[PDB]
Amino acid sequence: GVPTYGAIILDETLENVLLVQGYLAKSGWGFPKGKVNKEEAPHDCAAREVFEETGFDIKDYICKDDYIELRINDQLARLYIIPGIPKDTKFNPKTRREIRNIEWFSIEKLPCHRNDMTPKSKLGLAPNKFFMAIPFIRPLRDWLSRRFG
Ligand SMILES: c1cnc(N[C@H]2CCCCNC2)nc1
Question: I need a surface site. Which of 45, 81, 90, 129 has the fewest CB within 10 A?
Fold first, then answer.
């Protein structure tokens, strides 16, 4: 799969993360990210996509060693960790045809898994509007614990 790059932007308290809401197949909340172009460096793709989806330019803040990367059905998603972005930053998605909304979410309030349907004797997972973000939540929490204590 074509790899994707983007960012986990946190505020000054490290409590909150910036999520974006897409449309249609991507109707729920996820991290800002997108597909690398031919001959584009990972960090450049992350800045370009995040600027398209948030209106915020991370280029000067990216630490090239600080990221969470997951393989999800043989597509790599790498999200560069960007702490310390003020909560009052004015975000303005560029791609309004793809981005419904942009908001800060409390890390401790986000799910790190979806719930089963064992109460209904039914297989599978209940819908959750954070499904795109969820796989990154436990890895983020662990990464923060280590880097900040
Ligand atoms: C898996 C799939 N997509 C995502 N994030 C997308 C969030 C919604 C806006 C469109 N582009 C980024 N995260 C994990």
Answer: 90
